[PDB]
Amino acid sequence: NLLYDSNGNIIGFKDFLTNKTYTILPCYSGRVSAAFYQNSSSPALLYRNLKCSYVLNNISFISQPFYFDSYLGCVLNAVNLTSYSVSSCDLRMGSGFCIDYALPSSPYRFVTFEPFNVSFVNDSVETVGGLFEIQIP
Amino acid sequence: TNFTIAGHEEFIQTSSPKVTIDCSAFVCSNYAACHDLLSEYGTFCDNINSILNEVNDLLDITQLQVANALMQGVTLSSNLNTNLHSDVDNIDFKSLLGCLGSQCGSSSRSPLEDLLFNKVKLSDVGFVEAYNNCTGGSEIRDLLCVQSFNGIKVLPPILSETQISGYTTAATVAAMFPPWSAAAGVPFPLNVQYRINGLGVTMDVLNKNQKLIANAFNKALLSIQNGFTATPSALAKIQSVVNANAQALNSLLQQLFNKFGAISSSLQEILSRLDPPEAQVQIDRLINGRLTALNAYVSQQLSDITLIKAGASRAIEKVNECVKSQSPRINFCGNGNHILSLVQNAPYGLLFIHFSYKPTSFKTVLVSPGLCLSGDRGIAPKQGYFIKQNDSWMFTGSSYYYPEPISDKNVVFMNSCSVNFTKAPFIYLN
Amino acid sequence: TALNAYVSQQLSDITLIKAGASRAIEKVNECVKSQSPRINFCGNGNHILSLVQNAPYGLLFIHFSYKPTSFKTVLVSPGLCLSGDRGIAPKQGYFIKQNDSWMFTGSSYYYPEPISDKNVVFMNSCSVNFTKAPFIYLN
Amino acid sequence: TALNAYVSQQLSDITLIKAGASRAIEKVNECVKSQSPRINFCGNGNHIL
Amino acid sequence: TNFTIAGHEEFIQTSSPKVTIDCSAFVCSNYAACHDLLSEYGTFCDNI
Ligand SMILES: *[C@@H]1O[C@H](CO)[C@@H](O)[C@H](O)[C@H]1NC(C)=O
Ligand SMILES: *[C@@H]1O[C@H](CO)[C@@H](O)[C@H](O)[C@H]1NC(C)=O
Ligand SMILES: *[C@@H]1O[C@H](CO)[C@@H](O)[C@H](O)[C@H]1NC(C)=O
Ligand SMILES: *[C@@H]1O[C@H](CO)[C@@H](O)[C@H](O)[C@H]1NC(C)=O
Ligand SMILES: *[C@@H]1O[C@H](CO)[C@@H](O)[C@H](O)[C@H]1NC(C)=O
Numbered sequence: 001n002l003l004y005d006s007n008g009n010i011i012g013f014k015d016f017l018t019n020k021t022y023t024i025l026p027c028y029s030g031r032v033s034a035a036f037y038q039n040s041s042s043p044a045l046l047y048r049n050l051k052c053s054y055v056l057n058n059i060s061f062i063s064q065p066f067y068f069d070s071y072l073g074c075v076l077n078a079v080n081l082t083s084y085s086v087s088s089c090d091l092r093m094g095s096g097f098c099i100d101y102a103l104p105s106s107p108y109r110f111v112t113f114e115p116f117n118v119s120f121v122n123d124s125v126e127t128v129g130g131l132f133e134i135q136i137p
Numbered sequence: 138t139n140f141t142i143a144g145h146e147e148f149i150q151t152s153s154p155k156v157t158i159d160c161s162a163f164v165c166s167n168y169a170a171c172h173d174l175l176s177e178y179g180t181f182c183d184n185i186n187s188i189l190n191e192v193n194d195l196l197d198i199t200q201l202q203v204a205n206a207l208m209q210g211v212t213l214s215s216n217l218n219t220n221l222h223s224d225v226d227n228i229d230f231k232s233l234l235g236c237l238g239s240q241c242g243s244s245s246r247s248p249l250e251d252l253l254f255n256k257v258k259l260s261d262v263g264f265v266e267a268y269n270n271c272t273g274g275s276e277i278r279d280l281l282c283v284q285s286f287n288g289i290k291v292l293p294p295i296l297s298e299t300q301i302s303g304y305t306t307a308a309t310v311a312a313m314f315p316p317w318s319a320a321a322g323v324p325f326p327l328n329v330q331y332r333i334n335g336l337g338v339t340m341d342v343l344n345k346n347q348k349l350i351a352n353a354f355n356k357a358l359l360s361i362q363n364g365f366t367a368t369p370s371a372l373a374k375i376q377s378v379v380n381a382n383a384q385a386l387n388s389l390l391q392q393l394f395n396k397f398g399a400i401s402s403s404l405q406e407i408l409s410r411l412d413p414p415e416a417q418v419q420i421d422r423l424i425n426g427r428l429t430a431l432n433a434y435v436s437q438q439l440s441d442i443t444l445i446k447a448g449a450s451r452a453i454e455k456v457n458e459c460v461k462s463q464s465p466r467i468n469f470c471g472n473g474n475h476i477l478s479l480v481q482n483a484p485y486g487l488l489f490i491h492f493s494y495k496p497t498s499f500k501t502v503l504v505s506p507g508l509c510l511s512g513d514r515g516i517a518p519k520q521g522y523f524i525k526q527n528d529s530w531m532f533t534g535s536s537y538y539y540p541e542p543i544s545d546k547n548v549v550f551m552n553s554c555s556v557n558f559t560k561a562p563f564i565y566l567n
Numbered sequence: 568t569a570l571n572a573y574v575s576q577q578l579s580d581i582t583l584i585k586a587g588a589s590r591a592i593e594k595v596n597e598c599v600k601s602q603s604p605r606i607n608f609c610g611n612g613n614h615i616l617s618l619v620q621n622a623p624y625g626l627l628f629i630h631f632s633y634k635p636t637s638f639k640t641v642l643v644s645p646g647l648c649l650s651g652d653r654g655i656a657p658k659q660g661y662f663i664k665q666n667d668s669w670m671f672t673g674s675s676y677y678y679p680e681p682i683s684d685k686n687v688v689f690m691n692s693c694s695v696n697f698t699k700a701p702f703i704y705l706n
Numbered sequence: 707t708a709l710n711a712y713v714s715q716q717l718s719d720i721t722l723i724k725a726g727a728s729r730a731i732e733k734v735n736e737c738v739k740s741q742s743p744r745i746n747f748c749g750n751g752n753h754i755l
Numbered sequence: 756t757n758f759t760i761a762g763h764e765e766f767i768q769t770s771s772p773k774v775t776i777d778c779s780a781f782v783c784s785n786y787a788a789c790h791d792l793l794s795e796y797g798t799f800c801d802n803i
Contacts, residue, residue: 095297137635344692457607468735
């Protein structure tokens with residue numbers, strides 16, 4: 001009447017009154033990671049690996065006007081501005097993503113982290129007349 | 138007499154999965170009576186989360202130091218366009234270049250790096266896609282569902298794979314086009330001849346066998362790329378990291394099913410068959426047992442990051458002393474004869490490609506360590522030997538047999554006639 | 568139990584200090600008291616000198632570097648082949664053409680100077696990727 | 707509890723032994739089997755072999 | 756003006772003695788009743 005795995009956890013059963021089979025799955029119990037500025041009023045929430053339309057409908061009932069899907073999860077109280085890049089952040093959220101809170105819509109943002117870059121030069125990589133063009137101090 | 142060019146791989150681990158564990162939901166997930174007995178150990182759980190935070194901070198600092206060394210003082214042209222030429226000196230470096238610039242998608246890894254991430258499931262992107270398929274769908278049989286719901290989750294690093302893969306590409310194109318910020322001039326076709334000459338090979342042969350050297354690099358890279366369809370030492374070390382981390386997380390998860398002397402392992406059964414006064418003695422045995430297993434994991438994880446941080450320091454040195462600038466050190470980058478070294482991105486570390494000078498043929502000759510001339514003078518060779526051909530003294534290199542006349546540009550002068558030097562009052566140089 | 572957890576953290580904390588202190592000893596013996604041919608070790612590329620000072624719980628290092636201010640583009644050549652199938656390549660510099668004549672310049676400062684034996688290397692082959700210049704014999 | 711204190715202590719001393727062994731390997735390849743141009747590494751400045 | 760050659764010696768530790776500990780030889784020597792109370796702890800000795 002019961003189904004178990006190698007570790008010893010029940011993952012199913014069978015009811016003897018209706019002759020039906022089911023599957024037991026662990027219920028959600030997670031944790032929220034929030035970033036807060038120095039003298040702000042409300043931190044920016046981030047539910048990791050939780051798509052939107054599920055937090056604001058099943059686990060959260062607080063009216064949140066700003067929400068969008070990201071690569072890490074459903075972000076609350078933020079604006080989608082991933083096109084902007086900044087080489088300095090104190091709020092690092094994941095794989096190359098930052099918040100970059102701006103001094104006063106949602107004051108917090110969501111930008112890309114690019115700490116290191118290269119120095120470009122306006123030269124030609126193809127030789128001309130058998131010579132090369134470089135810069136000498 | 139004859140020579141070829143060889144190549145080999147090398148993997149150095151510079152990263153580790155970041156694990157975050159909370160002792161609140163591990164022992165007292167949802168039971169209220171559990172928290173009343175854990176409040177006495179309030180400082181005990183606060184330190185567990187504090188140590189796990191400073192461990193992940195060390196992996197973040199070491200990750201930025203590797204990325205900084207890859208692009209430390211690199212200059213590239215604004216008209217590079219590494220998608221049309223992809224070649225230099227008839228050498229195929231297409232398998233070592235991805236996409237440079239913002240005119241591409243989210244994937245910019247080189248073809249050689251694709252053979253390494255297609256064999257490792259639990260990569261940086263693997264943990265993100267795995268945790269996404271638990272809160273919705275069907276067939277929830279993955280073991281990461283239970284670990285995440287009990288308080289064991291892996292966080293992604295600061296820099297993504299695409300960003301790190303884009304830093305190794307800039308270091309490769311650096312020593313291919315002007316201004317050659319990875320070799321301080323001395324273009325790639327000439328940079329190889331300068332270092333081979335340092336081993337004791339004359340430049341008269343290198344300038345005549347430029348096609349043999351060019352075809353040797355293409356054959357070496359082809360054997361390395363084809364060598365991944367096997368069980369090499371590189372893939373064995375990469376898979377050992379993701380397998381050792383899985384065993385540590387599964388062993389800690391089984392600690393919730395032990396009794397430690399109590400009547401059972403589930404807190405709901407204890408709080409449903411015993412009175413409150415005699416129930417604290419059973420819960421205390423579970424709290425004192427689960428907290429001990431946490432210290433065993435924290436102490437083991439701290440003793441593991443020290444070896445990874447120590448190994449990461451060696452990888453930074455090889456970028457600065459073997460890739461971006463060849464050092465005069467011997468037996469450091471490779472094995473004896475060393476020419477160049479290239480770096481590529483690898484899961485939880487970096488991959489190095491070392492090129493070496495490997496002779497094929499040999500011949501026996503009679504050499505002399507130095508001869509004394511007429512006039513109480515003496516000479517000594519410089520990275521070579523003195524041979525006798527047709528009743529005349531010549532000069533040859535220590536790594537290639539090619540007789541050359543004795544001159545002042547390859548012979549060290551001396552003002553003393555030693556006793557164990559061969560006499561030859563026929564050779565005149567001044 | 569609390570004392571066993573504290574002494575376990577000391578063994579792991581000092582282990583990281585031993586690794587950091589080993590680099591400080593190597594830096595003193597190779598950056599301030601001696602100049603070693605190791606690029607990107609004592610500083611960020613162009614390293615000249617290094618000084619050490621006493622600091623609370625460690626040491627303080629003072630690194631001096633070489634930072635250019637202005638730049639100038641110029642057509643350079645990796646080497647040229649002379650008459651008689653002989654070759655010549657520069658060392659720590661490039662070849663420039665000024666007033667229909669070949670000269671020598673440094674790789675870190677623009678200062679044309681005539682070609683001499685102490686500024687180039689001598690070869691015995693004429694590669695196909697160089698430029699021909701028979702007008703110069705010993706200039 | 708006594709076994710955990712012994713095992714945790716071995717995980718800390720193994721790093722010091724492995725770190726010191728890495729310096730020995732670097733010394734054989736740069737002071738014994740080869741003459742490196744590094745100063746104040748193999749000796750006291752006047753090192754010969 | 757004059758010189759000589761001096762010799763020094765140093766020691767660098769490389770290896771360490773290997774130590775092995777048994778499961779049912781340090782806590783419960785040969786007693787069967789002692790092993791019953793140890794089996795409830797799970798794989799505590801196997802991790803050691
Ligand atoms: C379930 O199946 C068994 C065997 O087919 C049968 O004896 C029993 O009556 C069934 N239960 C119900 C509620 O029909
Ligand atoms: C966020 O913006 C980027 C670029 O502007 C876009 O590609 C992405 O689809 C946006 N995400 C959402 C959830 O709208
Ligand atoms: C060296 O080997 C290559 C490849 O077999 C051959 O073409 C060449 O003639 C050889 N040279 C000598 C000097 O043996
Ligand atoms: C050298 O010259 C040959 C002959 O055209 C050419 O194919 C090759 O690309 C040149 N190499 C370089 C580095 O310019
Ligand atoms: C140096 O000292 C040795 C040992 O006393 C002696 O034999 C030798 O003559 C000395 N040389 C000079 C130049 O003083």
